[PDB]
């Protein structure tokens, strides 16, 4: 049983994924996505070990014909995938980069000596980390794993298959309050202009809290706003809205579809409708009856419903989100916002493991 990420932490928080060259992994179709993690010798979970692309259907190689079933078996790419920790926690950042850099040392010699065997549980040289196998059905070949050797590859990470995720507590979006908040409300989507806009709107109105509302109405109407613009761009189906009816071609599968999710740079990673229970009844009501009209104004009647409609029903960005992550204090906790670094920025490279 691999353990769930935990949920909760005081600030912000930063989660890695890599994506490793010179190896698959191979296992029965539908098979659960994690196989194994990687713990600190005092038990902390530092990353998951787990499936990522598809690379076909595995065959055993005939010269390693062991008597055992391999049929149905899915070869994918391996990705690392960190447990969050706090964004300015130094050791925490430190351990899960030098324990990927070890991981990746020991996948080495496993493709030399144990080539299309399971990762066996064990403990580093060092003492330092510590694998557990939760999905024993797999085997770790070289390259694509369709030949019985390997060309003697050594196992590496590089920035192509890198990501990082930040979390944020939802009410610091827009305040640029830390260089984290900084570095999100850098998204090209994120329009700052948003938050004056909506103090002129609501002049006549007695808010509970005008600056937060403000806040979540630039977050939102962004969101909303950039997500009917790669409707249009990408002829993507939304609700009940057909880029057809507009003349539109789908140039795209749907949200999900990784070049719709890289056009977004900064992917928000929680479900948009999450915001509103930071506000109260009353200013929830008066930010999202000012949304429409900002969508009404550039799109049409058609896509602005729709977007507004599908983000109303708990809509997500990119499949299913980070959800049930929080902030603040553990016994008074506040929402979380995610974000997924499509490609890692230079002000997050210090996050990330370098192969030597
Ligand atoms: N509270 C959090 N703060 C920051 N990053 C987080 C948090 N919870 C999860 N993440 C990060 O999310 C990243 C990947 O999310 P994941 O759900 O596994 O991707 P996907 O489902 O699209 O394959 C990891 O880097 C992980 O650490």
């Known amino acids: 049983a691999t353990p769930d990420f935990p949920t909760h932490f005081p600030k912000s928080s930063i989660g890695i994924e890599n994506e490793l060259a010179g190896l698959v992994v191979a296992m029965p179709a539908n098979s659960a996505q994690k196989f194994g993690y990687v713990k600190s010798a005092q038990g902390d979970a530092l990353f998951m070990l787990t499936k990522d692309m598809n690379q076909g259907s595995y065959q055993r190689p005939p010269s390693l014909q062991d008597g055992k079933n391999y049929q149905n078996w899915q070869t994918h790419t391996v990705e690392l995938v960190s447990y969050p920790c706090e964004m300015d926690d130094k050791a925490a ?95 090209p989507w994120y329009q700052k202009s948003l938050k004056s806009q909506f103090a002129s709107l609501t002049s006549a109105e007695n808010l509970d809290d005008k600056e937060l509302a403000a806040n979540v109405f630039a977050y939102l109407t962004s969101i909303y706003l950039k997500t009917a613009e790669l409707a249009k761009k990408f002829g993507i189906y939304i609700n009940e809205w057909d880029p057809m009816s507009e003349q539109i071609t789908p140039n795209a599968n749907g949200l999900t579809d990784p070049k719709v999710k890289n056009a977004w740079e900064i992917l928000p990673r929680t479900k948009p409708s999450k915001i509103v229970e930071i506000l109260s009844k009353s200013d929830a009501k008066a930010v999202m009856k000012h949304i429409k009209p ?45 974000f997924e670094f499509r490609t890692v920025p230079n002000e997050l490279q210090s996050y990330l493991p370098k192969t030597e």
């Open 93 to 187: 950042v430190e351990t899960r980069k030098q324990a990927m850099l070890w991981l990746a040392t020991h996948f080495t010699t496993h493709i030399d000596q144990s080539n299309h065997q399971p990762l066996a549980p064990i403990q580093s040289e060092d003492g330092r980390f510590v694998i557990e196998i939760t999905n024993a059905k797999h085997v770790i070949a070289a390259g694509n794993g369709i030949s019985a050797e390997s060309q003697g590859q050594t196992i590496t990470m590089t920035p192509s298959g890198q990501q990082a995720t930040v979390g944020v507590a939802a009410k610091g979006f827009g305040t640029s309050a830390t260089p984290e908040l900084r570095l999100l409300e850098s998204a």
């Open 294 to 338: 900002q969508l009404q104004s550039r799109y049409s009647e058609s896509l602005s419903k729709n977007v507004f409609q599908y983000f109303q029903d708990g809509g997500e960005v990119a499949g299913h989100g980070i959800n049930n992550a929080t902030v603040g204090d553990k016994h008074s906790p506040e929402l979380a916002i995610l």
